[PDB]
């Protein structure tokens, strides 16, 4: 038996425009990046760099 749960909420309108968000590793971690211009969805990269 499935019963839809229905919630009524206020309906304000808001300005809505995506802002770039960067992700950063926490202390103890680092992010490796693949720098190949021809990179596949998976597999090895020979040009690899480290970023925070």
């Amino acid at each position: 038996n499935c019963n839809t749960s229905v919630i009524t909420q206020a309906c304000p309108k808001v300005s809505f425009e995506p802002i770039p968000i960067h992700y950063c590793a926490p202390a103890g971690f680092a992010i490796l990046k693949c720098n190949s211009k021809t990179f596949n969805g998976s597999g090895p990269c020979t040009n690899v760099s480290t970023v925070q």
Partner: antibody
Framework: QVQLLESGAEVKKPGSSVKVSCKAS????????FTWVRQAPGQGLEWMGR????????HYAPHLQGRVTITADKSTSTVYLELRNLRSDDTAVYFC?????????????????????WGQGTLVTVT | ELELTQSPATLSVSPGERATLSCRAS??????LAWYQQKPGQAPRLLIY???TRATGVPARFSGSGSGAEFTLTISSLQSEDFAVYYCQQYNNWPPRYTFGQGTRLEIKR
């Protein structure tokens, strides 16, 4: 284009319950919303609630919800009102109304708060 | 919640008169107000919605306007045909706790 056909009159002993209904005709039931009102017997009107048929969702007036259920069965194009724990205070003419919505089927529902299509009125009293 | 007050309980009119039926809201609304005609034994026909827009089938005699909490329905060249109890309805609510005024009757004096 929307016809509303009300159910007949009824009388119930206080503490009991009544269920009344409206049949929609000439249009697609799921296409648009319906509401219920209570017309007091020689007094003004009370909004009772609203039912959305595209979403099976309903809202009620704040002093009625412990007693009122508004539902619908789209397969018979019928809107239903059920009241429990009745009092003589609830003697009134009850009825449906509808408002055409912008193609709810396509998800272009307006949620209009005013009503255009009105039923005849069904008197419910107590005994 | 919302409450609406009709200023006249009964408006003093005569045929050809300009009816002026005001309605005061307990709180502000912008366009989400409508007017209806309750004739004895009849359905409360919709006249005006959106504060000023007339519904299809409504005579040109019926018009109105308002903002905030102050709205008026007027009837140009009032006919005996228009002697309905007029109700003011306010719906700028979500959840939709919609409300009604007490109703104004028109009466021809004599």
């Amino acid at each position: 284009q929307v016809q509303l056909l009300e159910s007949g009159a009824e009388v119930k002993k206080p503490g009991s319950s009544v269920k009344v209904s409206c049949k929609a005709s000439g249009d697609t039931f799921i296409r648009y919303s319906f509401t219920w009102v209570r017309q007091a017997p020689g007094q003004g009107l009370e909004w009772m609630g609203r039912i959305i048929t595209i979403l099976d969702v309903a809202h009620y007036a704040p002093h009625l919800q412990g007693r009122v259920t508004i539902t619908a069965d789209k397969s018979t194009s019928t809107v239903y009102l059920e009241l429990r724990n009745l009092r003589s205070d609830d003697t009134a003419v009850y009825f449906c109304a509808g408002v055409y919505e912008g193609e709810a089927d396509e998800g272009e529902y307006d949620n209009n708060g005013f009503l255009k299509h009105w039923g005849q009125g069904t008197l419910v009293t107590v005994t | 919640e919302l409450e609406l007050t009709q200023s006249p309980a009964t408006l003093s009119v005569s045929p050809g008169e300009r009816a002026t039926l005001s309605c005061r809201a307990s709180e502000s609304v912008s366009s989400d107000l409508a007017w209806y005609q309750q004739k004895p034994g009849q359905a409360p026909r919709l006249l005006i919605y959106g504060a000023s827009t007339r519904a299809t089938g409504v005579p040109a005699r019926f018009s109105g306007s308002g903002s905030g909490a102050e709205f008026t329905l007027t009837i140009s060249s009032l006919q005996s045909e228009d002697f309905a109890v007029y109700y003011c309805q306010q719906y700028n609510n979500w959840p939709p706790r919609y409300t009604f005024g007490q109703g104004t009757r028109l009466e021809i004096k004599r």
